[PDB]
Every structure is written in structure tokens, then in C-alpha cells.
Amino acid sequence: TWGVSSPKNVQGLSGSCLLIPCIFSYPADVPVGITAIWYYDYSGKRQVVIHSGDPKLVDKRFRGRAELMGNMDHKVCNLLLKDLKPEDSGTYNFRFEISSNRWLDVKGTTVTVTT
Ligand SMILES: CC(=O)N[C@H]1[C@H]([C@H](O)[C@H](O)CO)O[C@@](O[C@H]2[C@@H](O)[C@@H](CO)O[C@@H](O[C@H]3[C@H](O)[C@@H](O)[C@H](O)O[C@@H]3CO)[C@@H]2O)(C(=O)O)C[C@@H]1O
């Protein structure tokens, strides 16, 4: 079945890093490269944190501070956020595109960054 599995909320500290564990799934009948995209505040600012298809789409606010630590071939979508700022608090949502066969996790993971 289609889905993304990750903690609902995670806490982080200013200046530190945060690794959001992530595993995704899709039906075995779907023909398969997979594009990985992580959004920040999808329903609002909708800024691109990670984009494996075209890194040029990444918002300047995240360039050099975020990296996809997962192996898409192994269905791992781990997100590493570096040099955390209080402004990084908010919800991050993963989206993967295969080919109609695309999926956006509406749940996402909410990050809280304190001093
Ligand atoms: C396998 C599959 O069916 N993939 C669909 C996906 C998934 O259903 C979805 O990602 C699961 O979360 O939906 C696709 O279309 C959706 C996409 O365009 C999003 C963009 O935000 O909107 C969805 O419609 C929403 C709409 O935006 C809301 O305003 C409304 O209240 O609810 C609608 C849903 O009922 C689209 O369904 C996708 O690309 O993600 C199409 C894939 O084929």
C-alpha cells in the first residue's frame, strides 16, 4: 500500500542537527528512478527542503543545511537538518514521485526547535 512512516513530532536544539527517520511504501504492482521531495510548511510557505530531481529548486533557506540521508532504492527517506534555527520549527512533508504514481504524505512531521 501507499504510505510514509515517520515520527509525528520531533524536538531539536538551536545550532544542532536533527535526523528525521523515514520509510515509505508503494504497491508491488507499480512499475519503477524515484524523485524525492521534502517540503517545509506545505500548506503555507511550501518551501522545498530537498529535491533529488533538481537541487536548484531547493529554497535558499535550506541549501547546504539539508540532505537526504536515505536510499530511495531501499525505500528509506531519512532527512537530515543541520544548523537548526528556531525558524526551522514547523511541519515537514515528504513527497515521492515514480511516474500518476506519486504520493504526498499529508501527515508529515512537526519540528520544534528551542534554545
Ligand atoms: C497513488 C495516488 O493515488 N497518488 C495520487 C496522490 C495521492 O492520492 C496523494 O498524494 C495522497 O496524499 O494525489 C495526487 O493528487 C493530489 C495533489 O494534487 C494534491 C496537491 O496538494 O491535491 C490533492 O487534492 C486535494 C486538494 O488539494 C484539497 O484542496 C482537497 O481538500 O482534497 C483533495 C484530495 O481529496 C490531489 O488529490 C498527487 O499528485 O499527490 C495525484 C496522485 O495520482
Experimental determination approach used: X-ray
Three cell numbers written together for 107: 501527515
Domain count, the chain: 1
What is the structure's resolution, reported in angstroms to one decimal? 1.9
Report the CATH number at residue 6.
2.60.40.10
Helix, strand, coil percent content, the chain, rounded in steps of 5 = 10, 45, 50
What is the DSSP-derived secondary structure letter of residue 8? S
Residues of the chain immediately before an interruption (C to N > 2.5 Å): 32, 99
Residues 6+ apart with CB under 8 A from 45: none
What ranges make up the beta strands (E) of 7-114?
A: 9-13, 18-20, 23-25, 35-40, 47-51, 66-68, 79-81, 90-97, 102-104, 109-114
Distance CA 100, CA 97 (A): 8
For a mutational test of ligand 1's pocket, the pick from 103, 105, 106, 107, i.e. the residue with the most ligand atoms closer than 8 A to its C-beta, is 103
For a mutational test of ligand 1's pocket, the pick from 26, 29, 34, 102, i.e. the residue with the most ligand atoms closer than 8 A to its C-beta, is 102
Please check whether residue 12 is in contact with residue 109, taking contact to mean a CB–CB distance below 8 angstroms.
no
Boundaries of domain holding 45? 1-115
DSSP β-bridge partners for residue 71: none
The continuous run of DSSP H or E covering 67 comes out as: strand 66-68
